[PDB]
Design a protein around this nucleic acid. Sequence first.
DNA 1: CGGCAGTACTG
DNA 2: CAGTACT
DNA 3: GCCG
Length: 320
Amino acid sequence: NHNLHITEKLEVLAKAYSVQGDKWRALGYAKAINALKSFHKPVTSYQEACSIPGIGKRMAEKIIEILESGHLRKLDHISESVPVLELFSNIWGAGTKTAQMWYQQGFRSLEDIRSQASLTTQQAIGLKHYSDFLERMPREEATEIEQTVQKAAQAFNSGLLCVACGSYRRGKATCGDVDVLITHPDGRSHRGIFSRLLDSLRQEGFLTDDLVKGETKYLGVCRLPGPGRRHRRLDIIVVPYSEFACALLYFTGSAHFNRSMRALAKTKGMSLSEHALSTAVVRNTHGAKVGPGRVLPTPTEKDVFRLLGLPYREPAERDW
DNA sequence: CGGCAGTACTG
DNA sequence: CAGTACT
DNA sequence: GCCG
Ligand SMILES: [Mg+2]
Ligand code: NA
Ligand code: NA
Ligand code: NA
Ligand code: NA
């Protein structure tokens, strides 16, 4: 990163807008920050600032203040509420609206939340694991978690395919959580496995708490056995084999990679989701789907790239 | 002016 | 529905 | 916040 002196300051503002609910302004900052990290050389001129996609007049102005004075005065006017709003929205299940409500109600610490706040089932689990969920795990531990799910799944049906996606598949040395995708090549026998799989994972205490228990998605909490283990976030998605490539692409990410690819698809009259790549998608002027279109055959991830006119990228070069 | 990705789940 | 979450 |  040629421009840490700039991005470190912008990241503070980005996070401030995010926790206060100003999601589109925060998005613009996040995109400018990534663009700046991608640039080869230091940004040295306002003219060079606007040069970059994602950098407008306002962002170029802030870059020029930083280079000339080494500071951004805007940082000095960030609301005193922001560190508390960040503290609260780092509880799993609490976002900007819940954080702002707790702040308005006078809560300033997790002790206040613990002792006085009305918590959802999800949020009580988030609070109970507050520290652990802010920690990453070594890639090796993610391997052990993936293998634990796979062995439980294959005990029911040897034919089930299980793959750890997210940052693991993108090759990262550490992982925030584990993202396991499950399917069956026979196109049918992925159905109804959750009850048995999850109960199997419960029985010797690997699965410690459930956050979401849907027909397709599980989100919860696990812990490997033995001393020195922390609780880890675990997500499981079960999909029919017909959707495997698009589900794999979705679940491998990154989030910004997916958003960029989906935006591209929309420009080409197509729609990309974890279910399918569709074409002849009829939308309105608001960019919203009014006609479904046709699902395009995507047996592999490479087929999705090809149909979008893009060269294939291995998971490691999707880490946007 | 207005989209900024597209979807699942909760209560 | 609004909110929060996932990549 | 940026961009078409
Ligand atoms: Mg993940
Ligand atoms: Na620009
Ligand atoms: Na949260
Ligand atoms: Na009180
Ligand atoms: Na996850």
